[PDB]
Amino acid sequence: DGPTMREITETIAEAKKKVLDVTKEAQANLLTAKHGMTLRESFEDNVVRFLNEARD
Amino acid sequence: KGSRFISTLQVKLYGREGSSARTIKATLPYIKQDIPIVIIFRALGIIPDGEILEHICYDVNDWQMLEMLKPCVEDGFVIQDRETALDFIGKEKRIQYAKDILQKEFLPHITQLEGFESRKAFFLGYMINRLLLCALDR
Amino acid sequence: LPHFSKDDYSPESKGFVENSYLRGLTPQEFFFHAMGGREGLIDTAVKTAETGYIQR
Amino acid sequence: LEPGHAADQEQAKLIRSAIEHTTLKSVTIASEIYYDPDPRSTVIPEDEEIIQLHFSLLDEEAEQSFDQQSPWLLRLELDRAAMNDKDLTMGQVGERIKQTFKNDLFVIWSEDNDEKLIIRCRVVRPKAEEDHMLKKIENTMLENITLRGVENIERVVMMK
Amino acid sequence: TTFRFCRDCNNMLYPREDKENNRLLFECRTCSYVEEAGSPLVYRHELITNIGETAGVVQDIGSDPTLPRSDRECPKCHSRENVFFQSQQRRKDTSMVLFFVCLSCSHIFTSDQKNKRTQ
Amino acid sequence: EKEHKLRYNAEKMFSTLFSKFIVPETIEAKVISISQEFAHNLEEELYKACLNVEKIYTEKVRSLYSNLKDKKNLELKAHVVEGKLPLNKLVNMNASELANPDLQEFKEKRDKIILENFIV
Amino acid sequence: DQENERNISRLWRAFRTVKEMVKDRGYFITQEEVELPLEDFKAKYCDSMGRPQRKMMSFQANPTEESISKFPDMGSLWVEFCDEPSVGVKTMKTFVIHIQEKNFQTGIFVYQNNITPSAMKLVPSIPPATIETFNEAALVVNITHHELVPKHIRLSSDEKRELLKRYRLKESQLPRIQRADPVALYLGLKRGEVVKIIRKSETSGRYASYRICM
Amino acid sequence: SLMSCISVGTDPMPIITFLSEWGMEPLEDYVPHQSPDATRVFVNGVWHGVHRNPARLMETLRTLRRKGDINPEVSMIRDIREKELKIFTDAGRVYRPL
DNA sequence: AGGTAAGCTA
RNA sequence: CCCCCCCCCCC
DNA sequence: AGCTTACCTGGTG
Ligand SMILES: [Zn+2]
Ligand SMILES: [Zn+2]
């Protein structure tokens, strides 16, 4: 459905802003790393999660 | 093109992370052992340190890299002139044999000619700079 | 890819395929999916031989 | 966890901190070697209060360390975030070094409070050439000495 | 650290104690040279290194097309002309801080909100 | 026997602490005779802690000194000590609770953040 | 107090486990003797300073009436604790003679850190009597108490004979327990002895296996 | 790929000659603290010397190839951050048109 | 290439 | 040297 | 102790 496609695209779009936000959060050093993880290892886990939640 | 001298030069960083006296030695073709870089430079005619150090670390401010080279100076300290350096690459028979290896087999690209010790020195120096840059996580 | 700017941690740069198979993949989406797909074929060949011996 | 402490999160935290491996390297910023000749005083004015608290009173059998120690100083700077993170005292850390090298290493430290976290170490000479000996002792210190935890147990995570 | 060489043979200078006057000297082990030490510091370790972050900031940094651009005003000249990179320290742990170079004054500044940095 | 010599030097720096720390009370809303007497009320108070039932102590003297000395953030807490705040509980206090309210700001922000990242 | 408290706990924890093992081994020990509380242990085996006096801890254990029926030749046991972290050859001889004179069947030596290679050589020196060595640390936790550790039962020579008859077995054909195995050590298994292992089964509920010592 | 080609191998000496004629100081006479910013110039992994204004040099070479004067198959890179200029006459390099 | 388990050189 | 088979599946 | 070194590595046509 055309309406279903809109709902899909916005779902991807919001996950993309969500991701941009956590990227801005990490660039301003306001990001705190999870146990046994690089600040970067942490960020990537968050990003991957956001996108995989999105495709589902 | 020309004979195809497939000789690969290895410049090794001995000692591991958080290990006392991290020395640097290079493996030359037709010489069993890995010679400490400082000797290879003195064999090339670059005799003082800070002239050998000048060829490796270009910024005379990078204290990190310079302290990374203090052990190399100690390892090489035992030799002080070109003869003593050519001889370590072995009498009279060994000194002559050494000159030949450094001329035709050590860094054969660049030249296999003769009087290009400075051109091959700065190159070895470039390798050691590149080695230490990765070791210091840069 | 040489089409991207340096230090780009975005969904697009790091390989997010936003598009469906019906809509079709962009050249970039196509190439990342191409790398992802290649990985699969390798651990297929690998697992096929490893798993075989395990049985023996 | 013990049958009676199944939901006690504090019991979990307490074991977690007691089992996880922690080395002196984990809390060190940088190590340094200085020529500080008279041990009864200091060239570094930053440490003026460090000598004024411990080299001070006591005085636990003064000269105590014979004071005929070593002119070569080994100085370690510890990370405030990392110390509090793994929950450690300057006194705790100091006692681990003091107990590792026994009486052949005179140790002092800046207090938890102080703007800078410092551990001052001097070799104990019985009755020339020491520069190498300190680089040997700092390599031991960082790579060896365990401050907290069980060896091999590297990362410890809580779970409900 | 920042060490010297022997004027006379340019060789490395090794430490030595003048026990009589309680001062440090640096001697040449290839000749009879000696000189008073400048600082009491001899060796510096550094486990957590922060030097190698702003590496390769040549004045031609702007002429790299691969480098991205931002519209953040300069904290010294106030220009919305920047070329930005990430920490050149090629260590695993390294934070994702951004270093901005002005293309109207050639001065570096970060997006870091945890520290009041001037390097 | 040797303990007495050690215990004497302990009270000595407490009066030193109470002579150049007692000034910010008079400089901002609260002489050496008051210090010596008040400094004694810690030496034997901390002695109740060590050699229990039947080593720790010396390190607890330094913690008491360095922190109560601090100022101008820790003098606001040191003001409470001279103006009715347990001189009995402050001896067996010893930890991060002695530290600056400015230091405690960051210590609280830190601790509560570790717990979020290792609770998985 | 500091870290004296932890050493006292550990030593008492290991004392319990020794008593647990001695009881399980056949010998007469009460659950009251076993479940002895820490405050009582302190008040019995610690000096004026409240510091552990191991020499006092050493005890004698005699087989139960039940044990006498299965293994008639099972004699009495002696358990010794030493206050020397490194147990010297001069101390080991003192122990060996105790077992020989009082004609003990088994002797167990609980040590702190080590026993001299000199001392550990005069161990098989007094047959038919047998000497055992346990590090205090290994005894802190009773491994037999674990989830994964099923009940092992030492079989009589007659019980072993029967197993072999009833399955038409040669000793080679039985599954094997290693002599140095924690449970083999706990029960003081000698080579050739058989252990009946009764474990729970997701298929049958209860399954009995057997292992012979090596 | 359809539009990809592989370098046949060209002559380095004309580029080497052009370079030294365009501000390339020889390696034989380099003094690192005298020329600290200096960009390292490599013709087929052979370090030849250093150049003081790499920006203008790079332009000249690029304009030379585009015109035809430097063979089109010859690869030339300027790693501004690493202070390096690598050039390849080299046979075997895989290339694509853009 | 890779994990092992003999086998033995400084 | 190819061929062969290349299940399943994010929720 | 830490070098070296032989042993194997899916199926059919
Ligand atoms: Zn000299
Ligand atoms: Zn600017």
Short mmCIF file of N, CA and C (backbone and C1' of nucleotides) in Angstrom, two decimals, chain I residues 6-10, chain K residues 1-5:
data_model
loop_
_atom_site.label_atom_id
_atom_site.label_comp_id
_atom_site.label_asym_id
_atom_site.label_seq_id
_atom_site.Cartn_x
_atom_site.Cartn_y
_atom_site.Cartn_z
P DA I 6 52.48 -37.36 22.41
"O5'" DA I 6 53.91 -38.03 22.14
"C5'" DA I 6 55.10 -37.31 22.41
"C4'" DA I 6 55.77 -36.89 21.12
"C3'" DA I 6 57.30 -36.94 21.15
"O3'" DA I 6 57.78 -37.84 20.15
"C1'" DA I 6 56.51 -34.91 20.20
P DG I 7 59.14 -38.67 20.37
"O5'" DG I 7 60.27 -37.59 20.04
"C5'" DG I 7 60.37 -37.02 18.73
"C4'" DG I 7 61.27 -35.80 18.73
"C3'" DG I 7 62.40 -35.85 19.76
"O3'" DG I 7 63.65 -36.14 19.11
"C1'" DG I 7 61.38 -33.67 19.57
P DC I 8 64.97 -36.50 19.96
"O5'" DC I 8 65.68 -35.07 20.15
"C5'" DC I 8 66.01 -34.27 18.99
"C4'" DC I 8 66.11 -32.79 19.33
"C3'" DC I 8 67.36 -32.36 20.13
"O3'" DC I 8 68.11 -31.38 19.38
"C1'" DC I 8 65.39 -31.35 20.99
P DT I 9 69.65 -31.63 18.98
"O5'" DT I 9 70.26 -30.15 18.95
"C5'" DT I 9 69.92 -29.24 17.89
"C4'" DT I 9 69.47 -27.89 18.44
"C3'" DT I 9 70.58 -27.01 19.03
"O3'" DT I 9 70.57 -25.72 18.39
"C1'" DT I 9 68.72 -27.13 20.49
P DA I 10 71.83 -24.72 18.49
"O5'" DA I 10 71.50 -23.86 19.80
"C5'" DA I 10 72.45 -22.91 20.31
"C4'" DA I 10 71.82 -22.05 21.41
"C3'" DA I 10 72.79 -21.49 22.45
"O3'" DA I 10 72.52 -20.11 22.69
"C1'" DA I 10 71.05 -22.69 23.53
P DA K 1 58.59 -24.26 31.57
"O5'" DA K 1 59.50 -23.53 30.47
"C5'" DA K 1 59.82 -22.15 30.61
"C4'" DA K 1 60.66 -21.66 29.43
"C3'" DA K 1 59.87 -21.34 28.16
"O3'" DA K 1 60.14 -19.99 27.71
"C1'" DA K 1 61.67 -22.85 27.68
P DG K 2 59.05 -19.15 26.88
"O5'" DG K 2 59.36 -19.56 25.36
"C5'" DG K 2 60.43 -18.93 24.64
"C4'" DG K 2 60.80 -19.74 23.41
"C3'" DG K 2 59.77 -19.72 22.26
"O3'" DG K 2 60.44 -19.43 21.00
"C1'" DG K 2 60.38 -21.95 22.79
P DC K 3 59.87 -18.31 19.99
"O5'" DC K 3 60.62 -18.64 18.61
"C5'" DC K 3 60.27 -19.80 17.86
"C4'" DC K 3 61.43 -20.78 17.79
"C3'" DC K 3 61.32 -21.82 16.68
"O3'" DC K 3 61.94 -21.32 15.49
"C1'" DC K 3 61.82 -22.88 18.76
P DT K 4 61.21 -21.43 14.07
"O5'" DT K 4 61.22 -23.00 13.76
"C5'" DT K 4 62.46 -23.72 13.70
"C4'" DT K 4 62.23 -25.19 13.95
"C3'" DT K 4 61.48 -25.92 12.83
"O3'" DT K 4 62.27 -26.98 12.34
"C1'" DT K 4 60.56 -26.46 14.95
P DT K 5 62.11 -27.46 10.83
"O5'" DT K 5 60.87 -28.49 10.92
"C5'" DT K 5 60.95 -29.66 11.76
"C4'" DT K 5 59.62 -30.42 11.80
"C3'" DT K 5 58.76 -30.37 10.53
"O3'" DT K 5 58.44 -31.70 10.10
"C1'" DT K 5 57.45 -29.96 12.45
#
